[PDB]
Symmetry: C2
Subunit: 120 residues, 2 copies
């Protein structure tokens, strides 16, 4: 019986970006914060960890130009969520008819190459 | 206010089952529910969870698997080499860790069949 003492999802960022990142996440979503340079951020009662890729030996880049990093957020107002994020630097992506069928009413990409879709 | 925050792992068309089966085998993930081939499945693991979903159901997105995705997870465990072999038997590929990677304590590393990099702490 092998067990794991914890499971975290690591959002890699380019060199010296962990700070621009929290900065952007604290703003666009209201995330709450908390060798390897990293910062744990909290949204909806769960967390992720933004990590500086240059501070993780073994890795070469954050793949920010084409990462498959995708998060889902639930809220009561997806339009107001997109607009808040865009005023903070995110780019609104039109939600396909398809995404609207799964209730995914809003969607944006951020400066770190992550894709966030709002599920209402 | 946000009421849920869930990572979405994008995988190859028709492969959500191979992933649901794989994640259970390698890590003992738990399927807390799914939606029908499988369109998506949320997996519980070590107190958290991630959702797996066939990209063919989400046009515009890209798994980024052929060019390396940045999907990275950390899993703390008592025996890293054991978890590495346990994951390799399910189809993952072992990545040797160097001394530089030792100072931090991550004595194992694999990239699963879905392009995810899993670091093991110990």
């Amino acid at each position: 019986h092998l067990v794991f003492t914890e499971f975290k999802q690591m959002l890699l960022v380019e060199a010296q970006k962990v700070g621009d990142a929290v900065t952007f996440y604290k703003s666009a979503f209201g995330a709450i914060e908390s060798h390897v340079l990293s910062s744990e951020l909290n949204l909806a009662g769960s967390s992720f960890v933004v990590c500086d890729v240059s501070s993780l030996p073994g890795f070469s880049t954050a793949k920010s130009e084409g990462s498959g990093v995708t998060f889902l957020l639930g809220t009561k107002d997806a339009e107001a969520a997109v607009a808040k994020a865009v005023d903070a630097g995110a780019v609104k992506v039109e939600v396909t008819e398809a995404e609207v069928e799964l209730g995914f009413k809003g969607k944006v990409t951020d400066p770190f190459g992550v894709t966030w879709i709002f599920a209402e």
